[PDB]
Amino acid sequence: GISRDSRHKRSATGAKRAQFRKKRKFELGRQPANTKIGAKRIHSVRTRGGNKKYRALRIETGNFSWASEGISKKTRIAGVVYHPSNNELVRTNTLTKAAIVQIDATPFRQWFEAHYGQTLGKKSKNAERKWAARAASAKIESSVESQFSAGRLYACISSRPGQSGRCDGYILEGEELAFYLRRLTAK
Amino acid sequence: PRAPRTYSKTYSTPKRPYESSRLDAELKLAGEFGLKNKKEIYRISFQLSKIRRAARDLLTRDEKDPKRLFEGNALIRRLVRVGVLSEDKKKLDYVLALKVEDFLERRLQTQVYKLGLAKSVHHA
Amino acid sequence: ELTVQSERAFQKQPHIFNNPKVKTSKRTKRWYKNAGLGFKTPKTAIEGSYIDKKCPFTGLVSIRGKILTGTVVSTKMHRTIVIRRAYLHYIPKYNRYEKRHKNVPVHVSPAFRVQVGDIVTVGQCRPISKTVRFNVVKVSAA
Amino acid sequence: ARGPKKHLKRLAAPHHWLLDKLSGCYAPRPSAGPHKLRESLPLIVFLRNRLKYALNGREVKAILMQRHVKVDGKVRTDTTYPAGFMDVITLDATNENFRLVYDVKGRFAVHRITDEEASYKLGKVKKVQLGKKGVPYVVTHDGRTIRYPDPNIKVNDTVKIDLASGKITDFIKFDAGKLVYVTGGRNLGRIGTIVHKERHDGGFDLVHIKDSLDNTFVTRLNNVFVIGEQGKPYISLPKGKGIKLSIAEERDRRRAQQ
RNA sequence: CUAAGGGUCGGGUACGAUCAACUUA
RNA sequence: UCUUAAGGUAGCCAAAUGCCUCGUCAUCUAAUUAGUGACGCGCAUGAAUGGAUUAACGAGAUUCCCACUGUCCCUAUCUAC
RNA sequence: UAUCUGGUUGAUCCUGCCAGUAGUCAUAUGCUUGUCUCAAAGAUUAAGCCAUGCAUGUCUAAGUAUAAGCAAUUUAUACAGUGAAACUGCGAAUGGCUCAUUAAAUCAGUUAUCGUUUAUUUGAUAGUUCCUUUACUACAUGGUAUAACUGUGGUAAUUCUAGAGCUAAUACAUGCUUAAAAUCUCGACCCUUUGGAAGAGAUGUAUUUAUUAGAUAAAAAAUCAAUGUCUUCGGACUCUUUGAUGAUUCAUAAUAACUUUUCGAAUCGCAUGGCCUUGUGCUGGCGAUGGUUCAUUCAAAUUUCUGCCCUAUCAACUUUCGAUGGUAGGAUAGUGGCCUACCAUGGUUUCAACGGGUAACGGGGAAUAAGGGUUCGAUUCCGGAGAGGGAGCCUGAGAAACGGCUACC
RNA sequence: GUCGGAUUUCCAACGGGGCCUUUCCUUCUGGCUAACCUUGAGCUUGGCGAACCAGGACUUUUACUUUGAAAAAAUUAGAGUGUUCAAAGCAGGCGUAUUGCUCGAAUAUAUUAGCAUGGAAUAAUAGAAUAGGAC
RNA sequence: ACCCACUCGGCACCUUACGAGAAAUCAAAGUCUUUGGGUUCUGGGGGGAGUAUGGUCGCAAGGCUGAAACUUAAAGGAAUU
RNA sequence: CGCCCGUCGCUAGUACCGAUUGAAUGGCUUAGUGAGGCCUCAGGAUCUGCUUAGAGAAGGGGGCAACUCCAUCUCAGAGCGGAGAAUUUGGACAAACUUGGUCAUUUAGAGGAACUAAAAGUCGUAACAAGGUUUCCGUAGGUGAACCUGCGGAAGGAUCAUU
RNA sequence: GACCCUUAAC
């Protein structure tokens, strides 16, 4: 089947190599998951040594982290808007590692309200006590809050859905968000 | 498979077959000692070759070399034990001068001849 | 060596987080390591901006195994150079030697400036590309 | 080979087992166990060839099947359990006790140790780590894992076990001027008394050792087993005390003290 | 659907909206 | 040996030049007065009355093959005038 | 055992071959049925084709037997002996054979894995599992398609097969019981004056972020809008916790979380000892088999550091479609153009690349030797490859297995 | 005077080591205080350092040393051994006649790249030349 | 411009001469079995044969590179008579 | 009266050129066609609650006009709590063809042109002596054959030599 | 001046 050996590759001098052995099991490859969105479907793959591996197709939700806030929550994925490897992955809405995606932004927004509770723009007693201590920290970044009006957060996914069966990621932040915003809104 | 059983030759044929001086001496040797073959002389000269080769390599090494101090003494004790070279030497001398006549003089065919129980090498 | 973010993907050191909440001088904290074996981490690597995941100092490769020196015969690949290792091979029959060379392609971090003619030290790393197993860790040019 | 080998030809077994060329074509493959393949002595070749308590592997299995032999206190009812260096094995018939030790020439000698001596064994710590839950542990040369070691002990030290529990009763550090055993290399079986260790940052630390006869030699660090301080070793040494007599003086000692 | 390929300015000592046509892949 | 001013050289050929002739051998075919290759005492080849060759070119002679087909086996049918 | 000798001339000295000579774990063959030990043996041609018969099966005190199998009951009226089958488990990936392919490719010296392990062995290690949750309540312990076996079967035929009724589940939503203590998160009691309660939960292991983490060479002082687990609004500002490597984002913590239940023993044998208000009720001892994780062992995969015969009658080679490098992803057990999305012509080459040949598997070695060498090495050991030729794959820890399967030739 | 037998001082090439001769084998952290006229009986109750020590990016670059941490076994060379000898094999040997004990299974770069406080003789594109040099 | 004496460089010049060589002979053809200053090219019995299935240069003539089958006991060098 | 060269003729052998587009065999196509596995989009034979007031053939508190978490063998549009064979319904590994390229003396061929040998053959006599024109080299032309001739060169010459 | 040749037959 799909092989990972170097024996079929031309040598560094350019010489074509003669066949030395048949394809071996330990040097095999497999077909990609090509993970899509919707109605989660993960097929188990048996690998070397037992060692089950979960191949995600058509995944719905994912656990995404807000690094500057130290929080992560389960959240469905709207779709991928940018992929460095190939633009067809964006068009097909394929979920592979490092894909830029938009997430629901709602569990973060509702956590932001129940953790900081500050007013965008211009309560219990134990709530207000924790509110005061957590003040002077609810002004993270305009480029992030502007995404909360539309209810969608730009994010990277850092897990490998075809390997672990999971779509996990983090919200785009800081200079990284400005880099991809520049490419996303580029003419 | 089981480990191979090693084997080695014991005799060596002379380079030039029809040597009048060598042919006469070897058949002269067989008569005086009652040997049945020339191979019985070839092996003794082959055995002597391994001995002269051993002492020659040892003697190229310097005096008080641990190799010849151990290997030379061992060769002396083995050769003295079998009586080929004289026992009143301690100088690693006779080994390179050992002649063919010395080895087959110590064979039992002639050993029982001169011990008086045989009366002839052929009778022995 | 002109732009860090000249790529389609954002270039960064993995798991090295600069919190946008905090705001101090030298904001973008850069991770580096000592390669060991007495090699000195260049100043260009400590306060450089390049990312180079294959850099021996600011990347995720570790130097271990053979350490070699050679003369740079090529610099026309991006972050990769070819060094020439000239040696003498003994032919016992003639009791003398013949000149032999091997080209080894090694990775050169933007922490170093390398041109053809320099003498570099390379340390073995895990396979970095199809042909590369070595990383430049020292350059004999000023 | 598509998978692990299970046979071991003769001429491919380790030389120190003292096996002959003929009378069979398979040498006893030591199973997986505390000691490596090459640096181990199978119980089959010990009980049979070392002592002649048995004439063949069938009859060693008869010896084994009745739980008479036990190494480190545990029975080991199998033909090819790899008993290795410094392992203590016991034959409860007449209370015969054995410590698998190296002789001068690099082979596993046969000891006779007492009961209080057979209680303890010496293990060289191969590495020091902490496992799950922050619990520290040390891996010995025979694959034992001992949780909660003394924090003072590092790699290349020697801990002594009690073989009735898994704890470390005592230990000895690695430094200059400590009695050591050579386990491997061409200096196998020589007792060393460390004088210096040169590092070579990046691989194969070398140690210089001189025995009682003022003969110095160098061996890799992985071949050094510390066994005590100056004077008293922690274990009973074999006959000859690992002094490496030369062939000339071994020839003399064989002649006089037959 | 995507990519590539152009024209027009105010300089305290690398910057942008404009605007524009059919050739390729 | 007789004879010519000289007795056709280098080449080429059953050639658009060979009568005999459908020359002989080979190849091509099931079968070839065709074609090609080759060969000789060439009716009557042959050197600017130019010889031999020759890439490219040709509504120029010719032979074969693949393709293709109503040229044919074996005709049938349709349209306009 | 550092030899040479014959042959060109009428004769001589040479050059130079031919021939002789000796060996051959080099083969064949010629000439022979009377000796001891030892021993190669369908490699060369045909990795050609195979009739037949064997070459992988497997049980303990201890996973299942009511065999309608054979057998003295009072230790065998639940079974407790032996025991054909069948299930389950393990093994069949070892072994053995052969040398076709294969020319930096195998291989050899066994560098590295800080680039990936866990039939197994050995050692260690899981008080966290009423997940419809302060018992509103089975663990003195919730079931089932089907094997054996009984039963008229079908087919010429095969180690072909559902057709009617029990077992191990370990097969499946299979599924409980062990508060602990500490920390963290949120908080249902009155005008609080640093508010302070119980209360509700979470925190075992198995899969992304971010980190006070994972530190560290040697001295005394200033300043923090929202007032330091303490004090009399100027006292101590006090060991403060920190393991390894040459080196790490290492080991291992801890914090959001995520996990479509991974595991976290409803299993088995022998032993029935003992305080008791006679109930398995308080506890029982050896063990067998465990499924997880860590280490260990046996292994596997992956590189070129250097090294390979002849050939220029092979000088240029690498040509959407990889061909050197970059970035990212996918795949993989894992690294890696291994594969997928771009520039630059990147990489190799007279120090011989790339082609061609090999009556080429590599090596340990063999024969032959004054010293240097030359030739050989199918073959007892090691490594590789293959199972008529290709290709693909299931199971399994491990195979691209062929005395496993699938397909084409 | 260290056994048919031998003692360094009236003699060997001494192979090597350290110190002076401009000569130098990088010098400084301190809990150790080392060779130094800081000293209790013919020898230390205050100090200068390698027969002792962790704290410097820096032992020009190499080839060629000697030295060996290593040719898997088998094989080869080779030690011992009463296979009857030998090829071979790794065995065996010896008793209080009757108990038991004991030696072995050594040891050796026939091709080439890592380490080596001791080796710079041999042989090169290394340093300070419009000083950018050293202390 | 000649003559003597030097000297450097050059063309050369008298011997079977220490040495070398098979000898012819050799101011190098010596310092070479007492075998090593540096370096390039070429040969390995005679013939087939400097004959291409090839390649390359040349207008051509040809140059350069360059076999095998097969067949031989010699071919050859320098002397002597 | 030695030796000795070439053409030509007869035999034999070896190799070469050569129309014939067979070198029929022997590794892959940036050509075609896709066996079979594997992944995947679907597909759905096959069965757990067999819970819905049917069912004057089961006792049911009352003085039988549908009052009870109930009935066979008939079954529920209770969504719903589930596995799952045949079925290329796309890919990827890779395979099902009178077709270009190359080759381990590697096998045909009219004819052509060499070489070698044998040979009691024909023609001359080119070379070896100044070989009767010294020989030889390179080159060009010519001629039955050796060979001759032109031009330049060599001595390996038949001259180491002239005033 | 001209001058070619020479056994298969021990």
Domain coordinates of chain C in residue numbers? 1-142
Helices (H) and strands (E) in chain A, counts: 6, 7
Q: Is the CB of A43 under 7 A from strand J?
A: yes
In sequence order, what are the residues at sequence separation of 6 or more whose Cβ sits closer than 8 angstroms to the Cβ of residue D87? D34, D35, D71, D72, D99, D100, D121, D142
Chain C contact present for A154, CB below 8 A: no
For residues A41 and A128, state if they share a domain. no
Of residues A145, A143, A155, the one with CA closest to residue A79: A155
Q: Are residues D148 and D99 in contact, defined by beta-carbon separation less than 8 angstroms?
A: no
Number of residues in chain D:
258
What tokens appear for A172 in the block? Answer: 């785009």
Question: Determination method here?
Answer: cryo-EM
Nearest-angstrom CA–CA distance, D125 and D154: 7
Nearest CA among D172, D142, D144 for reference residue D158: D172
Do A49 and A36 reside in the same domain of the chain? yes
Please report how many Cα atoms fall inside a 13 Å half-sphere around the Cα of residue D171, on the Cβ side: 22
Residues belonging to chain B: 124
- In sequence order, the β-bridge partners of residue D219 are D207
Considering its fold, how many domains does chain A have in total? 3
Task: For residue A125, give its domain range.
Answer: 106-151
Say whether the C–B interface has 3 or more Cβ pairs within 8 Å.
no
Same domain, A71 and A134: no
What is the distance, to the nearest Å, from the Cα of residue C86 to the centroid of all Cα atoms in its chain?
20
> Same domain, yes or no, for A58 and A90?
yes
- Phi then psi dihedrals of residue D252, to 5 deg: -70, -45
Q: Do A140 and A52 have their domain in common?
A: no
- Same domain membership, residue A38 and residue A87: yes
The enclosing H or E element of A164 equals helix A161-164
Left if phi > 0, otherwise alpha if psi is -120 to 50, otherwise beta: which for A90? alpha
Sign of the four-CA dihedral D243, D248, D252, D255? positive
A182 and A76 Cβ atoms separated by less than 8 Å: no
Please, which chains are in contact with C (at least 3 CB pairs closer than 8 A)?
A: A, D
Chain-centroid distance, C-alpha C96: 35
The answer to whether D202 contacts chain C (CB < 8 Å) is yes
Q: How far apart are the first and last CA of chain D?
A: 49
Q: What is the spatial distance between Cα D91 and Cα D68, in angstroms, rounded to a whole number?
A: 6
The verdict on A83 and A111 lying in the same domain is: no
Whether residues A88 and A174 share a domain: the answer is: yes
Task: Round to whole Å and give the CA distance between A151 and A145.
Answer: 10
d(CA A175, CA A182): 10
Question: Do residue B70 and residue D247 have CB atoms under 8 angstroms apart?
Answer: yes
Instruction: State the residue for tokens 């007449």.
Output: D94
Compute the CA torsion angle B111, B113, B115, B116 (nearest 10 deg): 170
B-proximal residues of D, 16-35, CB under 8 Å:
21-22, 24-25
Mention every residue, 6+ apart, whose C-beta is less than 8 A from residue C7.
Answer: A84
The Cα–Cα gap between A47 and A56 comes to: 15
Nucleotide closest to residue A44 (CA–C1'): G260
Closest CA to D189 of D72, D251, D109: D109
Does A96 lie in the same domain as A160?
A: yes
Q: Say yes or no: A21 and A50 in one domain.
A: no
Helices D247-256 and B66-82, interaxial angle, to 10°? 40
Nearest to D36 by CA among D82, D98, D87: D82
Domain match, A21 and A113 both:
no
Q: Give yes or no: residues A72 and A110 share one domain.
A: no
Contacts of C63 (CB under 8 A, 6+ apart): C35, C36, C37, C39, C56, C123, C124, C125, C135, C137
